[model samples]
Target chain A: GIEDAETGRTDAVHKGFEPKVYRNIVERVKLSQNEFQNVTLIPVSTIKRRLKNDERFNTQESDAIYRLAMLLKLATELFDDEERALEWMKENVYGLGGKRPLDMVSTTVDFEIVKDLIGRLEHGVFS
Target chain B: MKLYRLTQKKFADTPFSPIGAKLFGKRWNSKGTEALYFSESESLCSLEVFVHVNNDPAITKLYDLYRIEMPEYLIATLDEEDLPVTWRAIPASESTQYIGDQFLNDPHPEFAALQVPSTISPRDKNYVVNPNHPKMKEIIKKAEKLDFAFDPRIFK
Candidate 1:
């Protein structure tokens, strides 16, 4: 029953990713804290406050950030390389209307599209 | 008392003056001064004056000074181009801090409107300019006409 839902938001809320999760993703994304705030749509100061205060993010927002982390993690794992996966995110693909997947992912729907594409690649399928 | 604003001479030609409201980003998070900033004194030595006179091509040398009269009354029926009725000012030391920083991490659209930081100070009285507001352009026009002013020009 727990596994039936589409998103792990319930899981994220219950079993949150470690605080280091944010730090690791920040390092891998290679963006300055300000640039990261623009990309992630969060303020750098607030992000720091949350981490230090041990605060929680709401389900939808947390899930989105989680998905971003997962995307980077999977890309590195699948290609057995970090740079290759980072490039995949930055490159335009025909599947994503020639827009880089990273750039299109401001909304949940946009984020899901990129996640779905990654899932397909994991399953050895291409479309 | 009048509110003084310093800006590049180039903006003197524009129909509207640009004022910044509160915006959140990594850069804004650090400095915490993101509103339309203005200094109280025309002669106050500031970086804005230094850069403007040095780089501006319209004059051999001079930074433009604008004096503004606050609007006394505004009607609900006024057009979007009119001046905003409400403006807030802060003391010099108080202007650098904002209460909205607490909500900066919030991602919801509703909260975005709540993040307006102070732009005005005792020495630098700034106003928040919302372009979407009907009164945005009107304020600039009113300022231009009333004081219709200028600052010291550098000829070097």
Candidate 2:
């Protein structure tokens, strides 16, 4: 079951719902198609297609997108600014082997690592 | 070991300022054309780098390209073979166009100013090379002496 945040209906579900989640995350982070493609590792065509018209993303991809959305939401709160949050996502994280957070994004595990880092920063447990 | 930059001749009085690669996420406007444009060769043939930049008659009229020398040790710590792609071909254009005409409007402090020269490869249309590499002098000298000049070909 997928939910469209824009429609605000749990009943209005389809393949398009998954893309809604991804679009929300992209909007929240304020990334362009190129930046989003490079960071999310999602092809520009896929993102554009999903974003442009009705499309379907399976449960696994939906779940991954949900987690990524949550991660970005938490990042915005942690930085108190959407721009800073986006910057943190793109920059290298020492905890993540000096790789930029954007480069590490893909699976739920990767999103969790970034979420944990934000949590630590939120609590003033800088490392 | 020699480092060089090809820029408008009028930039001779200006301080060196070249955009970092997009991989670092240090700039809001990281484009394929932004990095500090340079070449390993000092010969007249290396003027090709400037020609690439001055392809437009409008740009050529306003800017005269000049060669600027930099300290070779600036890239001493970088591994020549492990450098990232300086630029990529646009998706729709296939391999015919090598340009990242995109921008990132976010700056990462941790990724700031980590200058690593891109490895010179055939795929590199701009012909970027590491001046700190041990054999850079010989390589450049060899290229200079050769009558054959390398250019980026738009494969049809």
Model 2 per-residue lDDT at B132: 28
In Å, residue A67's CA in model 2 sits off its true spot by 3.2
lDDT of 2 at A51: 60
Listed in order, the DockQ scores are 0.01, 0.02
Q: Could you give the fnat of all candidates in order? A: 0.00, 0.00
The sequence of per-residue lDDT tens digits that candidate 2 reaches over residues B33-118 is 33333444433223332222222223223223333333444332323354334322211121111222221121221211123222
Computed on alpha carbons, the lDDT of every model, listed in order, comes to 0.43, 0.41
lDDT of 1 by residue, A1-127 (tens): 4533643546864554545657777787876677666656767786787788887654554665766776687666544557767766666654455566666556777665565445333321112
Query: Lowest-scoring 10 consecutive residues by lDDT in candidate 1 chain B?
Result: B21-30
List residue ranges in candidate 1 displaced over 4 A: A1-10, A14-18, A119-126, B1-156
Q: Locate the minimum summed-lDDT window of 10 residues in model 2 chain B.
A: B88-97
Q: Write the per-residue lDDT of candidate 1 for residues B56-125, one digit (tens) a residue.
A: 2232122355555444342111122322323232111221232322333333323212212222222333
- What pairs collide in candidate 2? B9-B64, B28-B104
